Amino acid sequence: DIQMTQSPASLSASVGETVTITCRASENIYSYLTWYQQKQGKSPQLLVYNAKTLTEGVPSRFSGSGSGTQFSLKINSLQPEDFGGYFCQHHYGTPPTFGGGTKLEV
Amino acid sequence: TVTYTNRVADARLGTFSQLLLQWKGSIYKLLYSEFLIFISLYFAISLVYRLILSESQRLMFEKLALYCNSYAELAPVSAVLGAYVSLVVSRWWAQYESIPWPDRIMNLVSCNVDGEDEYGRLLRRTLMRYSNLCSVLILRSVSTAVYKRFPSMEHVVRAGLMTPEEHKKFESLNSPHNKFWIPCVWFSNLAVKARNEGRIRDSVLLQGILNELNTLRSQCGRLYGYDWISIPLVYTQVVTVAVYSFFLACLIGRQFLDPEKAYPGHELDLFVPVFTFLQFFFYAGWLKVAEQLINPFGEDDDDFETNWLIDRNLQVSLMAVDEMHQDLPILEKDLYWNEPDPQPPYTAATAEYKRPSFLGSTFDIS
Amino acid sequence: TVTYTNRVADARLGTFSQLLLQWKGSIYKLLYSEFLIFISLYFAISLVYRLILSESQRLMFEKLALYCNSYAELAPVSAVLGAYVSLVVSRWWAQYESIPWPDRIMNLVSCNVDGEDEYGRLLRRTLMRYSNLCSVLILRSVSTAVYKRFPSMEHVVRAGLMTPEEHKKFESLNSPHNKFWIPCVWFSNLAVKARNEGRIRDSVLLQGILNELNTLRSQCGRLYGYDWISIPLVYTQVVTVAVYSFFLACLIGRQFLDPEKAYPGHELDLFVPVFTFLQFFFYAGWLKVAEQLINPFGEDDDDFETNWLIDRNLQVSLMAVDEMHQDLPILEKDLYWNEPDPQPPYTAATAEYKRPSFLGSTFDIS
Amino acid sequence: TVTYTNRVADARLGTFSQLLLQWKGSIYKLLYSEFLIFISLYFAISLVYRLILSESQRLMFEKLALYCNSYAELAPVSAVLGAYVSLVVSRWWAQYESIPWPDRIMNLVSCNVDGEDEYGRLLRRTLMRYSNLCSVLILRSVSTAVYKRFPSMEHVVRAGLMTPEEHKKFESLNSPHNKFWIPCVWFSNLAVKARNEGRIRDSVLLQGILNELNTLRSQCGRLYGYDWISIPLVYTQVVTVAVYSFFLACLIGRQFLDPEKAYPGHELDLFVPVFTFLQFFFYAGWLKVAEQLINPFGEDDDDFETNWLIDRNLQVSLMAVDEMHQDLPILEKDLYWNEPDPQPPYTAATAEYKRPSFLGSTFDIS
Amino acid sequence: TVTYTNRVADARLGTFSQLLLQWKGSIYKLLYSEFLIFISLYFAISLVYRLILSESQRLMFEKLALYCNSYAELAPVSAVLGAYVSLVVSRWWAQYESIPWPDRIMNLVSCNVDGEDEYGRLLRRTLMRYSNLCSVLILRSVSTAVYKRFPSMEHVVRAGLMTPEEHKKFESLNSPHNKFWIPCVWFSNLAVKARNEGRIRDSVLLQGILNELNTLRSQCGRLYGYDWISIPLVYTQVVTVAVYSFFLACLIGRQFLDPEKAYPGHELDLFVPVFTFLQFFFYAGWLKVAEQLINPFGEDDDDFETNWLIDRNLQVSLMAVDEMHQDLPILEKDLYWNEPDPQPPYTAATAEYKRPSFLGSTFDIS
Amino acid sequence: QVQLQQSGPELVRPGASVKMSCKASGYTFTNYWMHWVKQRPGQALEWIGMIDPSKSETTLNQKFRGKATLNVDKSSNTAYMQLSSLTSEDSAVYYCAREVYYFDYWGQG
Ligand SMILES: [Ca+2]
Ligand SMILES: [Ca+2]
Ligand SMILES: [Ca+2]
Ligand SMILES: [Ca+2]
Ligand SMILES: [Ca+2]
Ligand SMILES: [Cl-]
Ligand SMILES: [Cl-]
Ligand SMILES: [Cl-]
Ligand SMILES: [Cl-]
Ligand SMILES: [Cl-]
Ligand SMILES: [Cl-]
Ligand SMILES: [Cl-]
Ligand SMILES: [Cl-]
Ligand SMILES: [Cl-]
Ligand SMILES: [Cl-]
Ligand SMILES: [Cl-]
Ligand SMILES: [Cl-]
Ligand SMILES: [K+]
Ligand SMILES: [K+]
Ligand SMILES: [K+]
Ligand SMILES: [K+]
To answer: Which of B181, B274, C256, D39 is the most buried (most CB within 10 A)?
Structure first.
């Protein structure tokens, strides 16, 4: 199995700030990583896929980077909506293990 | 035509066993009548021996069965059958690859016959139709499935494969031979006329279109050749005589003789010759392979789907030279514009198939 | 040549059995004389044994028959026969595909040699005739059916395949070898002269016509090669020695020995060796397959119809470059002008053959 | 795909023996389940005979086993298997050589589509992608390994093999048939448009690029043909019936009968039929050869690595027409500039391979 | 590679017998170790039976040997071996014809790249080297004999097959796959640049040079394919299992049993199984044919001489495009200038070979 | 528009079995692999398995080998998951997601 280690467990910031979440792969997963946003109670939503590419609805303030075993999500110029849960998932093989998660609080 | 390609994609437990339960184009469907006649003749003889013949006649029948049984030898049948069926299978695939496809001419006519005006459209559409007509004419000459759909030249016209003027011009040309080559001549003349009207830039582009036409003509010729030159009749008769000689021997030789008389080889009476019937399916079914593929343009389950090919070619042909003439999508930068070594993704189920590059056998894998 | 292609279109009950009742190009017609000689020699020996030999001589004959019978082994005959017949069949089809057809040159000359005037007509007609002459010359060199129709070069002229001036030019060129290549040179020169007179636009179109000529020359060369390079005589003798060795053994070995003497294997006397005669048709008929196709340009029933081909080619050739030069039908809009996805009709009998498009094995059929 | 080419480079002591210890794509992995079922059925029958059947029933089983054993004849199985597997192996290699490679078009597009500006770059990159798209589209239609990676046309787009505008244009063209031919038409149109914009000098160079495209189209057609036209089902069923008939006979016939009863041929009881199991690996493994290669685009160990090919082609294709367009190394004088007869060095290990020139068999070696 | 072509030129008394006395690439050299192991295992078992086993154990061994001997059946081995070796031999010759030769490109570059000045010379020499580099790169990937001579890309440079600038450009192009295709792209770019500099007149001549390059690329691809796509491992394992099964049976079955016990078939004790050892050479040697040719680019005696080919091609290539560019001998009138039917002389030994012209089979020889 | 509508919430006693659904709409059902994810509070999302709608080929997670079962109904465009030998730890939120090199559409849960 490929182990997804996410950090920080929770980050606290205020509107306008810029935070950066980090997922690290147990082994090389090339550019096969996706970023999801999940607000308590609702079902997760796709933010970034293929490590860098943003999906449809995602605003320009979201950006992904990394490759191999080191990836990172960067949310610059925070907003009220951007507060909640954030997790990653690798897409290189089966099973596609998920990350520990990150609680983004105000 | 009877495509099971996806079923046999992997070599699993029942890859081939599963196919024994299929009826369409199967050994059962092709052998049905023959098998029943064999079954009948066998058990008929069997009852005559068990219930009719006298003790003295039974002794002669037993001596006759030993004689017949000594001549049911497959080794000579396997020899001639294997060779003959190999010949049939060879011609079978050659005939398929001889079915002309418009795609190569289609690509040239679509891009090299200039004009976005009604004439340019009529020109391109008429050129393709001359190709499809050269084909439809030969297909209805060699395929019974197609001929029964175009029994007369009027059917060809009413189906929209030939215009009534073309049919008039067709009739005007007096020739006792098959005119399937006519549209192929019209094409070359129309392609040249198109070049003189300035619709075809160079002669390099014109000859290129003329070459792909000639190729299509050679395809139609191959189809004509295989239809005309049958496998020599004497060869076909030889293999049926050999096969039938065997089943004739089995009819009597494979009879279950008296167990009490203790004939060497006939110690057990099972009434039903399981392995002889299994040999019948083998050899009669093996002969049916040749029997079915000796003319792949017939109406067998595994005979080519020539009428569907005609429809697909008609639709695609015109569409590529009309709606697609100089009609391209919006040029965009590709997703890998700034990526020299792209790493296209893999689904969850296919990641095991992302392999390192094979450099050569000689290189050390490190 | 003996086409039964339509009879074997479908794999029905009697697809192959029906062919056993046909005489033309059949196994019976080719084996007739040989079989009778075998029949005679057999029953002749049989009567000498039953009616002439003494009790002591009969015991030697019985011991001789057991010796001969042990050497009637089909397995080695099947080996060499199958291989040899496969070689013959291979060359047989290669020689057919080596018979030159005008259609490819015909298409170019008809559209690329300009002129609707008598000279343009004479030019195109003379070009085609140089092609047909290159063929007729080689065919009468390799085909006995053709040679007996053109035994002398005068026959070629009087038949209208060569003009008396051409025959004069023909004789003027001093060469000890077969001149079948001469018309092929004339063509290239006449094609170049035609281009210099402005009757052939570019060199692209001229080289294209010269290429199809060279291809036709290669066809004639293949025919010359197969006629010249026979299958090595030693190989042919080997397979006849093997076959005859078998039938020699059978002549004595397959004799019906005394039933009373109770020889193992000879318990029943049928007087007529049914299965041995069935083996004769098999192997003698199998050898006749090679015997007939080893020279497919002879006068056998299944030998190629070379004289009809010459006639058909002559008629079609001239017709396509003369009456059809720049002569097209009236361009019309096709019946599917405004229909992007045409659905050509089907007759009542052929509607079952309107199939959905085969997209690929991988796709789910839903 | 399972390449052992370097292991079998030399014919040493264990060249082939060593391969018996390999599991990937091996006979053991493919026969595992079948063998166990055979093993079980065999030893199950064996115990029923040794421990369950009565003295009277054992005598029937022994008579039944002698009957079955007389019908386990490999010779007819070898005949049909060899022929069938040869056909499969033939198609197997033909399908491989039908996998389109960009390299030939790649070379032309890279050097003959002018422009060192963003448009020239976009032009060359878009041309190659139309080729790779023509391939990926057909590969995902015939290969389950590829289809599971591109199950929907959206996967193709998101993977960067097709732009969303191209997908829009793709959908805009209404056709019920497989559209794998679409990119191949776009290419010809885009190549012509490129020539009209002055990016392609002559028509000679344009037709040359169009020809290599048509060849690639013919490659895709061959793949479609082999996927569509399966080996006739009846033929496949025949060979499985023959193989299974043999193993059915062995299941009972090869049982170790009572040694005391002293049946001719059954003097020794080994409990485990060593040679019968070795015959199972032979024939069941021989059938598995056909079972695995009948569809070389599946997910078997020895099935083609179609997904890696797609990746390799994508990377190399774009790289050759973009980073390498009119981009050469610095021209230098070669190391043998003034040496007419260069003598390139040899390593210590390879000096034995420096041989004198082979002039011909006829020349005296002095 | 082991050429005996001149020895077998004629079919004399000892044409083939003489070859049994040759060691290089012989059956003895390839079977040596295997035969000794067989010899040993046989005579080891033989002594255990004659000197160790008790009277009771000998009876079991004799019963065991009769069992094994009944399973030493060559007929199934001959079937699978013949087919497998035929496949290997087919690929063997296909791989040979896939070794690229410069001669066709060599002829074009030498005559169509203008300039008798140092640049014209450097241009032609660099073009040829790009071809030879495309080859050397693939050869060192598939041939162990070549790789051991060019283990690293530095060896290629130091050997004078690639300049250090080219090696720099080579490394600059980032790609994870085999770069053997790089020189083939450089060639096309350099050929186009040469045309733009006015060194290549027309585009017809440029495309002609580009075509022969593409052909060379296809040659390298075939070599890559045969190296990558090994014969399916399961097939290779099947034939070794069958062969070894036979020799396993022979090891015990072919033991010389007690003559006194008078076993049918074992009446004479010769201690040494002459014909069994002769069968070993036959089948083990027959397997060695495939064993040696399954990878013809290895270091076997009969494996291709790939390093000599590289040397010969280098020398001839450069020489033809440099010293021979527009360099012809003095044009003279030929010795047969005024002789229309020349009669070239014959030596005394060859006068029997002056034959009359073969006109055709149909003509009367008079 | 793509929409994955799962079944309602369920309540069962330990040891029993349950079978929840997921009805897809707005896209070709058979062209996208369907996955199932388990969501427990405090733990990370667990991947249960996937199913190929076309051939009903299942690929489960070793951790759920004996607990989960997958199958679909191509006719009704719905996917199903069955959980057996239910315990207190099998209590969680279960999602069904569509895969396209990523999980772009989930169910409500
Ligand atoms: Ca048929
Ligand atoms: Ca003849
Ligand atoms: Ca070797
Ligand atoms: Ca497969
Ligand atoms: Ca000779
Ligand atoms: Cl037999
Ligand atoms: Cl033709
Ligand atoms: Cl039976
Ligand atoms: Cl025999
Ligand atoms: Cl020639
Ligand atoms: Cl008889
Ligand atoms: Cl047998
Ligand atoms: Cl095609
Ligand atoms: Cl056994
Ligand atoms: Cl044998
Ligand atoms: Cl290639
Ligand atoms: Cl011996
Ligand atoms: K099976
Ligand atoms: K029949
Ligand atoms: K070995
Ligand atoms: K000899």
So the answer is: B181
Residue type, E259: P
User: Residue E9 CA: which ligand is closest?
Assistant: 5
Give the chains touching A; criterion: ≥3 Cβ pairs < 8 Å: B, F
Q: What count of CB pairs under 8 Å joins B to E?
A: 35
SS3 C174: coil
CB pairs under 8 A between C and D: 35
Residue C322 lies in a domain: yes
Start-to-end C-alpha separation, chain C: 47
Q: Quote the minimal CA–CA distance from C359 to chain F in Å.
A: 14
Residues of C in contact with D176 (CB under 8 A): 341, 356-357
How many domains, chain B? Answer: 1
B149/C108 Cβ within 8 A: no
> From CA D168, how far away is CA D173, in angstroms rounded?
9
Beta strands (DSSP E) in chain C are none
* Residue B346 in contact with partner chain A when CB distance is under 8 A: yes
Cα→Cα distances B19→B27, D33, D84, D179, Å: 10, 18, 16, 30
Q: Mention every residue, 6+ apart, whose C-beta is less than 8 A from residue E310.
A: D344, E132, E135, E136, E139, E146
Contact A94 B349 (CB under 8 A): yes
Nearest ligand to the CA of C313 is 7
| Length of chain E, in residues | 366
Give the dihedral of Cα atoms D270, D274, D275, D280; nearest 10 deg: 130
Cα–Cα dist B73/D75, whole Å: 11
Count the Cβ atoms, other than its own, within 10 Å of residue B71.
19
Give the helix, strand, coil percentages of chain F, each rounded to 5. Answer: 10, 50, 45
C-alpha C185/C-alpha C130 separation (Å) is 9
Q: Is residue E277 part of a domain?
A: yes
CB contacts of E361 in chain C (<8 Å) are: 141-142, 144, 227, 295
> Distance between CA E212 and CA E110 in Å, rounded?
13
Which residue type, as a one-letter code, is found at position C200? I
Chain length of chain B: 366
A 10 A CB-CB count for F13 gives 6
Residues with CB under 5 A from ligand 11 (ion): C 273, 275-276
Q: Containing domain of residue E126, as a range?
A: 1-332
**Side-chain-side CA neighbours of residue C184 (13 Å):** 22
The token pair that represents C106 in the structure block: 């015909």
Residue E219 lies in a domain: yes
Convert E294-321 to b/e letters by CB count within 10 Å (16 or more is b): bbbbbbbebbbbbbbbbbbbbbebbbbb
The verdict on a CB contact (< 8 Å) between B347 and F101 is yes
Binning chain D into helix, strand and coil, the percentages to the nearest 5 are 65, 0, 35
The overall longest dimension of chain B from CA atoms, in Å, is 96
The pocket of ion ligand 2, defined by CB under 5 A, consists of: C 295, 298, 300, 303
Q: What distance in Å separates the CA atoms of residue B70 and residue B66, rounded to the nearest whole number? A: 6
CB contact under 8 A, D5 and E227: yes
Query: Within 10 Å of residue E350's Cβ, how many Cβ atoms?
Result: 9
State how far the Cα of D161 lies from the Cα of D129, in Å rounded to an integer: 7
Assign domain F1-109 to a CATH class: mainly beta
Closest chain D C-alpha to C125 CA, distance in angstroms: 31
- Joined together, the tokens standing for residue D232 give 């006739």
- Rounded distance between C-alpha atoms, residue A4 and residue A36, angstroms: 14
Q: What CATH number has the domain bearing residue A49?
A: 2.60.40.10
CB contact under 8 A, C141 and E359: yes
What secondary structure, in 3-state letters, does D255-269 show? CCCCCCCCECCECCC
Q: Is residue C365 part of a domain?
A: no
Q: Specify the residue for token string 């370097």.
A: D6
Decide if A15 contacts A75 (C-beta within 8 A).
no
Are B160 and C342 in contact (CB < 8 Å)? yes
